[PDB]
Write a protein that binds this ligand. Structure first.
Ligand SMILES: [Zn+2]
Ligand SMILES: [Zn+2]
Ligand SMILES: [Zn+2]
Ligand SMILES: [Zn+2]
Ligand SMILES: [Zn+2]
Ligand SMILES: [Zn+2]
Lengths: 6, 6, 6, 6, 6, 6
């Protein structure tokens, strides 16, 4: 699982 | 699962 | 699992 | 922002 | 921001 | 910011 917030 | 918010 | 906030 | 995975 | 994985 | 993994 990948969760990314830039 | 990939969740991305830029 | 990867969680990233820049 | 809310991201939830159960 | 809330990120939750159960 | 809250990050929770149970
Ligand atoms: Zn993954
Ligand atoms: Zn995936
Ligand atoms: Zn991983
Ligand atoms: Zn919110
Ligand atoms: Zn918040
Ligand atoms: Zn907070």
């Amino acid at each position: 699982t990948i969760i990314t917030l830039e």
